[PDB]
């Protein structure tokens, strides 16, 4: 006893909401797609294969759950979780005058059982030396204390920390490095007289 | 109390249902722990015993049981720098390495006295 | 090279956490040995080959329980059955050379 059931194509309404049929990622089951699509290299006398049992239609990723209708329907409900951006910080000139420190943090994604990526531990700290309160000798000492990490043409100091395992630990180490450099740039020891 | 678990399973019997949507299929797996936490951060589930940077970088606190003015400090500063520049190991493993060196040098006392440099 | 410069470098090393006192390049091998992960401890090294014993045991248990159907093992068993029916089987342990 073999039973043959007709697919959803004969029952699909022309005004039916498509995200209701394809809300999330699907393997592109031809039983729920009323669109006759032909994929594959045709024959000298033939045509591209039909959608039924087409391996090439399952090989390729489907964006049927990401049609513009579904994109709008999803983005409309996402207005509640987001916040408003301050319009007083549109130009970077005032952004540098208010928040001079830039914190570059890397984050990676990958499909699989593992999430740990050793490239994620690096934390970059970029500080513009023209927005601080260093004096002349303090700046001249900070230059020779940081070495090549300070770009003289761009007037920016870059501290790239990777010694701590955790990203938050590297962030704390970077802010400690900035603090200890700003503190040591002022101490005039005995060897600075020579 | 086993009766509390008996009530909890009877609550779950009417709470759970076969999945009617892929959204629910992801919600249940995210609440249980199968799905990842979005946005995907590469440090989810690893706290490193709640340690900070002062437990990793600053390791001079463990070299007090060594001669300061001898070559032992000159040898151990390199080990301290290497352990501070090692994001792969935890704090306890570095403490165990320091203790291994401590007990090795404290067990081998005749060789340091024979070498000509006084070590304790 | 000046005294002010060498003092500045000695302070920069102490602040950044590097080796402050001057050391020869040969003594930095023990620095690198702890600064980097050893070869035998890397995951790509110590987890090179998966558990082929687990693979084979799981497949055989499923085959004997009636879920997996190994065509290659069935072919081996059929060939061994035909060989033993023809008359050339595997001798018993201990009677091959003497007996």
């Amino acid at each position: 006893r073999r039973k043959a059931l007709p697919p959803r194509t004969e029952k699909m309404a022309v005004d039916q909401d498509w995200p209701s049929v394809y809300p999330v990622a699907a393997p592109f089951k031809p039983s729920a797609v009323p669109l006759p699509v032909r994929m594959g290299y045709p024959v000298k006398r033939g045509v591209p294969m039909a959608k039924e049992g087409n391996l090439e239609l399952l090989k390729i990723p489907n964006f049927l759950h990401l049609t513009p209708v579904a994109i709008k329907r999803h983005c409309e409900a996402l207005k509640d979780f987001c916040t408003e951006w301050p319009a007083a910080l549109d130009s970077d000139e005032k952004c540098e005058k208010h928040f001079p420190i830039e914190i570059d943090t890397a984050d990676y994604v990958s499909a699989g059982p593992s999430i740990r990526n050793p490239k994620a531990r690096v934390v970059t700290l970029r500080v513009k030396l023209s927005s601080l309160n260093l004096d002349d000798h303090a700046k001249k000492k900070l230059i020779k204390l940081v070495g090549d990490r300070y770009c003289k043409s761009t007037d920016v100091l870059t501290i790239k920390t990777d010694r701590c395992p955790l990203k938050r630990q590297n962030y704390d180490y970077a802010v400690y490095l900035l603090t200890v450099l700003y503190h040591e740039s002022w101490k005039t020891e005995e060897w600075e007289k020579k | 109390s086993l009766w509390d678990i008996e009530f909890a399973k009877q609550l779950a019997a009417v709470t759970e249902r076969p999945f009617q949507n892929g959204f629910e299929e992801m919600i249940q797996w995210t609440k249980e722990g199968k799905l990842w936490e979005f946005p995907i951060n590469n440090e989810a589930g690893f706290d490193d015993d709640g340690s900070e940077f002062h437990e990793h970088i600053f390791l001079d606190k463990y070299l007090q049981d060594f001669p300061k003015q001898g070559p032992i400090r000159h040898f151990m500063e390199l080990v301290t720098c290497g352990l501070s520049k090692n994001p792969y190991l935890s704090v306890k493993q570095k403490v165990e390495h320091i203790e291994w060196f401590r007990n090795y040098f404290n067990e081998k006392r005749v060789i340091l006295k024979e070498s000509g440099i006084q070590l304790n | 090279l000046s005294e002010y410069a060498v003092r500045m470098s000695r302070l920069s090393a102490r602040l950044f956490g590097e080796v402050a006192r001057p050391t020869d390049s040969k003594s930095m091998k023990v620095v690198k040995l702890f600064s980097e992960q050893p070869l035998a401890k890397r995951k790509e090294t110590y987890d090179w080959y998966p558990n082929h014993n687990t693979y084979f045991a799981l497949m055989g248990t499923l085959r004997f329980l009636g879920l997996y159907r190994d065509e290659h093992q069935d072919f081996r068993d059929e060939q061994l059955r035909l060989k033993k029916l023809r008359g050339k089987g595997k001798p018993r342990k201990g009677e091959g050379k003497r007996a």
């Binding site: 503190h183 020891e189 | 002062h54 | 302070l11 102490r14």
Partner: peptide
């Protein structure tokens, strides 16, 4: 030769690095 004294614990307690 000559070695300069560096305040390690002092800097740690000042910058919360102890």
């Amino acid at each position: 030769a000559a070695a300069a004294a560096a305040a390690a614990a002092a800097a740690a307690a000042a910058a919360a690095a102890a």
